[PDB]
Symmetry: C3
Subunit: 676 residues, 3 copies
């Protein structure tokens, strides 16, 4: 009985082969069903691919159903084959082929389908538009599931239309011609563009017409390899959220935002020929967690300076926990902006295209309040000599109202005699740093202890100083007369800060005793000397001599020729000294260039507690002993204060290169313009 | 041979039609398998739908298996048909129909199934309960994949039970009757409710009994259109995380939290009839990135004031990077709360239901530390006249301990003579703003330069002032005697701040010279005059006259009648003047109402550097020239300080309307109570 | 006709049973296709499971295809069966069995497949390695979809190899032996390990070789029950993002990070035997939103102290919105670190393994700027007597540069006479708290009002004080002579702060009037008295007596014996008094132990406005009335300032236990070393 034959043949383990199937959707349009809900198997969407197959079910009355070439296939007879597919569509359902094929139309059909799209692979496209509240796109990774713009395509790889709201873009890549490290770009391309809204609807969230409320999430999306912008959110769009956005390898601007009312979290922008980020006309937005690196990337060819971040014509921005680092020009340029609030801000090792040239934050006609600032320049710290920022802050105008608090100078050792702020440009702007009172702006009454002048002849001699010192004469300093200023105050455990303008006359071999605590140099001298030593060949050494706590230590270094002090040039010379903490700084007041070193922890043999036992007195231009070395040149504006960190010292230099450090800690301040 | 006929018939491209299938799960329960793992095709869950079909496999011994009407279907004979389904379930598997159908039971079966639920569409429900660590729900968008509460249903659309922990709610909508803009609500509804735990388990995370550790994520979820609450997290629940939560169109309170120990990131709450957010009994929580807008939304009918945010009976809250904007009443009300820490805070343009009536932050028996404050009132800036906040801060009690730092007054031009703080209510609370020393609380010794009184007769005349001025008499100001105060101090590039109480006598046409720098008015006069001009018709003009840097400029405006100065009323009149930066403020000390303007950037023809060349002296009530115009009325409490921004000026007004601006910058302060 | 028989038999609703299928992939390898793209049904991967089945399609020419035991199955004949599977793979496709089975090889095949992996259930594994940019893993919950390390397995449950970048790990669990509350661990296990990179590639993101750019997201992942680490990110890895990471039940360290350049948001680490978090050698990273609780968890057996967070050898860290709470030892230990920036920081109720022993933040050779600090100790507030931190801050070295701002002492009532800072260890470090000038470091000139000494005999008597008071003698205080200091200053609405060193002689029953405002005690006395009352049995009472605003109130408490004042011991005794706000503090200057109470809100019958009407004078050691009670012992270092919160009082104690509170508010300071 051939009946048993058929059952046994169909019942073989490969028996499914005997059930015919549709070869293609083209074949499917010619296959009329004879039963409602009739089941058919589709081998593949397009002949020869083995891609896009599935199961379809029939509506003999295909009325109100439209063929879309993927999930709704209509017959010549008017029936509709409907893909059995509850949830997301993917491009292969609509004829995508992957590989080098142009899958633009299949991908466009997905996001137009009325369902969210799943990217299961990498698809080449030219330009895709997201139009509906169903146009979500989901992948499974930042790389392998992605849209890839064709090399010939220009414009926006993805455009979010002003009719599209409340979608999710999650965990997929958006790659352009330059996606791979060190490759070139197709001109005029953008990864994701959010167009300016052309209208406002009254039926949100069911709107079908233009509306500014994007109210959508771009989450774990990786944009790489575009020319003009990675992501460009144009004016008029509200509530475009980004979350874990990663932007790599952009010829020009990583991310541009020109709109209001949005929040981004954990954004990273890396390696852009121009800015990593442009905020232009932004307001009432939030960035929380941000990393902006390798802006103004030189191999991307852009001659010309561009900062890591431009904040232009913006207001009411709260920007917390971001870092700008390794950018070729300035770190952050704030221009014509109001009320920029930054809480936890890290800017270090920018200006990498030209050493000692650019600044980490550049203020121009802007107001800002910046808290939790940090900026440890790891190139200066390591001593690598790599190009880095001249300093932290630069004011291009003096109508800025700016408050800055944090660690303005980090306080590492200074192997190459530099740190975070190596050129300081003071300003008359309405500026407050670290809550420090600006001496030029205070009427506070303070102590002002009077030192005793001492010399072989005890009559002070006064001589001219350069006009940069802001006075006519200063105290004549000579080795022959041992000119010095003796304070009777002794150093205590709170520590001390000592500073003066010194105009050194540098000729032959010589020891300059700029300032001292106590005298002598031995296990029990309880003394500090800051010295400039010139050997007979002109080599210059800055030496800190410490004696106490049962031992002696020399912390000195030979200056490279380009950092040597110049005869007749005024320098602000400052030290902070306290148990376990010594720093010195020499500041050229005509160029603003600074050298410095700082000693804590393992650099100190002992904390030298006994220097601060209220027994060693303070002396300027020599030590407290009649035989000590003195100085050659001129002194002025001698300052004694209680201990200030180098952080606060540098902060106060932005007010003025030669003024007292901290009015609330001021103990003595002597101009020395023909008086003591 | 009919064998070939069968193979050729089955082998047609539509051959799958010949394989029978089950019409419904009801039919399936009557279909006994004869082989283990036997495969059957289910056409659809419910007859007539074409929805919920799939492939099932048989367990002849359905023992320990329970029929659930979707993925486990048991036969009369005791066998179990198991849906071939590795991962998530969706409501259509359990009989959902979508459209207008009540899909409550299918959706409840999904979240009770033991698998996570995928929402592929919009489903109407009455009330759903999440009970298990498997009760996750995933959608593909904030709108199209959603639960939709039936119009007749009341109560919670979703309840998270105290047995439910460690689930994810990701990328779907939760809509109620009022979801669409401008529609009404069903009474007593809540979007998502997290119930108060009834117990604590000892076997987390495998607990099957009540526990407070929710430890779950609500992520990219959109809640819209509910009455009482969008999201309501009740007391006793720990670690309910929200991430990119979006709440729209709530009749009453957008989000209520009444518990401890949680973190939210990037929350937005928009358009609520009462508060956007209520924190009531909260502690040890974090909000990072928040947008709270259109609270107290008038068309939602709630008569009565409700703030954008209520912080009540809470403690140890860290709230970073949030904004409160466009709310109908106060911005933020902090009541009976300890240790509220805010870092990066934006409050602007609230109080929109009644102009000049509400305040951006209202403190009542609370302590707070607020850093990075900003609040550019875009309505005042644009000059639209839209209703906006009276000012930034209001203290309902004087037992608050509050620190505020930031841009308290933004410093835009003031087209309508107003800005951010238009009514100032000073307080005796333990308050510190912008690190400013409160003059009423300091013993610091400062400079106090003595001006020279000048007049046609050089003997000062003193007359009564209103008691609000805090002294018996002031300096008689007259045009006939040209009463004035001449300081010999000249203005420098750091700038200057000048202020006084002036009680003007306003009668006919007249020029009041409130204060001046230098004298004359020409390309090279290096002068500033602040003037009140009254024309013969009573119209009042506030004019800033600047001469220097080779040109002259008039920055004046006619006051609207409601802003005119009133004869016999005391005003605090203050200016800040420095190169490129001029602001003036007139403050009615009896009503706290302020008018003001500020000039920087393009409003200035030149920076007027030469006004600040240390050649132009300071004068109150006239200028330094014998022929200058003077004033009519009384003067008192003359203040000279180094430059303060309007930001710091306004900040210090919260201490006291008439005291010195900044003790650390004070140069002169003359009461003028029968002395100079 | 047996043809009709076959059609009718196949057409039965169970007709699918007649289509044969493959019993196993082993059977499949022996099934040669005869048509390209031939369809076959696979019943199951492994015989007897009903797991892993599906549909496969044939490539007769299996060339360039490799058998992987799940989705690519090759025949003896060289053909390839390809699983119809567009998107993610799951372990059951590769032979996983779930339950107690070791599914390591199936799971490893998934993440090696070239597709992302979906976890649909809980799978036991030993060790899994993520190697490719396709090795993403997705679950549907933090618990039920998970990897579970076998009890015998050691090492890393998941290792991310240095070839793996740009993947997502989303919404699944990683459990070890100790996952369930209160269970033990397998030695040497780690949840997720990110290995140190062995090289750098030049073709990112298409690299196939080692690279430091992880650039991956760990999102909504739950790690529980491992020994050494929950998550361990080793040196050299960049941009490992965590987002909503939840770590529970770790024998040792919840999370270790030893690398640079990363951002975490909303991390929670709960219940670790050692630290919740170790940052060791970190730099240029961000943590935004963090909860670290129950570190140093005693039942996990680690004898020895470990902080909630170790920050060691790190720099340029921005850590915003975190909380450390309920940890067994110190809260946060910062060692050998630069530029640690914290904005919004909550540390409370740590040190729970030994009461009054540990500190919330411990600084050692580190610099930090901390803003928005809060730390309401809920155990002290509730009066539970549970073990809690001795105090907020401890400095193990004096070379730290630290700025702290916030609510250093919360200001709740003090039911057990304690609060947040119960032992205070002052430091000579470069420290600034709440912007307070350190009196030891200021040269500012202030008022110093001179009191009038009064006694039955009006000649002051001076007697010795302990050396801890920093002077030789103080003012002899006796009840017989009514020794007192009368200021003529009266209290005003701004309030007042009064403090002194008092060395009490405690013998029999006695009333000590430490200090007073006004005199008398009645509805209209407008008076304040701070009293120590000793009854005849030695019981001690600290009483605040308030009279005014029409009533009287006693705010007193009996001290527990262990908190009693000791005869001959010096105490710093301070009050702040203003309308509606009264606090007192008694500080043992030899042990640093403090007791205190604070009265606001409901504790006050009235605000006692009339005490501050400028009519009641200030008195030390008695009141302004000749008959008032006085003191027995010695007084020294009498301080009058304008009102300071207890917050600022405690903050200033970290500078020095006995110095003036606030130099900018200082009104009087009398050493009393043989003078008045
Ligand atoms: Cl073919
Ligand atoms: Cl010169
Ligand atoms: Cl010069
Ligand atoms: Cl039917
Ligand atoms: Cl009056
Ligand atoms: Cl009045
Ligand atoms: Cl079997
Ligand atoms: Cl002693
Ligand atoms: Cl002692
Ligand atoms: K933050
Ligand atoms: Na079939």
């Amino acid at each position: 009985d051939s009946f048993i034959n058929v059952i046994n043949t169909l019942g073989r383990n490969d028996g499914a082969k005997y059930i015919g199937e549709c070869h293609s959707v083209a074949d499917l349009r010619n296959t009329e069903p004879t039963m409602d809900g009739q089941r058919i198997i589709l081998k593949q969407h397009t002949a020869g691919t083995l891609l896009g197959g599935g199961v379809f079910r029939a509506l003999i009355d295909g009325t109100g159903k439209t063929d879309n070439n993927g999930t709704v296939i209509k017959t010549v007879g008017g029936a509709a084959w409907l893909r059995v597919n509850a949830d997301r569509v993917n491009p292969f359902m609509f004829g995508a082929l992957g590989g080098s094929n142009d899958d633009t139309i299949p991908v466009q059909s997905c996001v137009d389908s009325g369902k969210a799209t799943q990217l299961t692979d990498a698809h080449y496209v030219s330009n895709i538009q997201l139009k509906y509240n169903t146009s979500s796109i989901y992948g499974s990774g930042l790389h392998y599931s992605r849209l890839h713009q064709l090399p010939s395509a220009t414009g926006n790889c993805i455009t979010i239309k002003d009719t599209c709201s409340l979608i999710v873009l999650d965990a997929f890549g958006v790659y352009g011609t330059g996606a791979q490290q060190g490759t070139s770009f197709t001109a005029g391309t953008t990864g994701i563009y959010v167009e300016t809204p052309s209208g406002l609807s009254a039926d949100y969230p069911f709107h079908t017409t233009a509306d500014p409320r994007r109210d959508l999430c771009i989450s774990k999306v990786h944009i790489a390899g575009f020319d003009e912008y990675g992501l460009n959110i144009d004016s008029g769009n509200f509530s475009v959220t980004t979350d874990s956005l990663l932007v790599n390898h952009i010829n020009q601007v990583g991310v541009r935002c020109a709109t209001t009312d949005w929040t981004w979290t954990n954004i990273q922008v890396n390696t852009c020929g121009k800015q990593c980020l442009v905020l232009d006309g932004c307001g009432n937005g939030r960035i929380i967690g941000g990393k902006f690196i390798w802006a103004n990337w030189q191999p991307y060819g852009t001659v010309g300076q561009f900062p890591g971040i431009t904040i232009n014509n913006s207001q009411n921005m709260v920007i917390n926990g971001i870092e700008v680092q390794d950018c070729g020009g300035n770190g952050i340029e704030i221009s014509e902006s109001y009320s920029i609030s930054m809480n936890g801000l890290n800017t270090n090792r920018n200006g990498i295209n030209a050493n000692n040239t650019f600044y980490n934050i550049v203020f121009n006609k802007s107001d800002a309040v910046i808290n939790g600032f940090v900026g440890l320049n790891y190139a200066a710290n390591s001593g690598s000599g790599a190009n880095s920022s001249a300093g932290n802050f630069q004011f291009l105008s003096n109508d800025c109202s700016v408050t800055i608090n944090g660690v303005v100078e980090t306080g590492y050792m200074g192997i190459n005699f530099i740190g975070d702020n190596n050129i300081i440009n003071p300003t008359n702007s309405d500026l407050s740093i670290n809550g420090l009172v600006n001496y030029s702006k205070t009427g506070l009454q303070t102590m002002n202890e009077t030192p005793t002048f001492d010399g072989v002849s005890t009559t002070p001699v006064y001589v001219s100083v350069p006009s940069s010192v802001g006075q006519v004469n200063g105290l004549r300093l000579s080795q022959a007369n041992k000119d010095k200023l003796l304070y009777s105050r002794t150093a205590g455990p709170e520590g001390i800060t000592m500073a003066a303008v010194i105009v050194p006359t540098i000729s032959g071999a010589e020891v300059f005793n700029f300032m001292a605590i106590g005298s002598g140099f031995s296990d029990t001298s309880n003394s500090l000397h800051l010295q400039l030593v010139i050997d007979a060949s002109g080599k210059q050494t800055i030496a800190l001599l410490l004696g106490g706590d049962g031992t002696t230590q020399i912390l000195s270094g030979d200056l490279p020729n380009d950092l040597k002090l110049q005869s007749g040039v005024p320098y602000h010379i400052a030290i902070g000294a306290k148990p376990g903490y010594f720093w010195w700084s020499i500041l050229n007041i005509q160029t603003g260039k600074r050298i410095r070193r700082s000693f804590r922890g393992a650099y100190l043999a002992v904390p030298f507690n006994s220097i601060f036992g209220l027994t060693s007195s303070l002396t300027f231009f020599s030590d407290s002993n009649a035989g000590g070395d003195a100085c050659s040149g001129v002194g002025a504006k001698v300052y004694v204060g209680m201990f200030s960190s180098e952080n606060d010292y540098v902060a106060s230099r932005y007010y003025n290169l030669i003024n007292p450090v901290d009015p609330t800690k001021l103990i003595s301040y002597r101009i020395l313009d023909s008086s003591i």
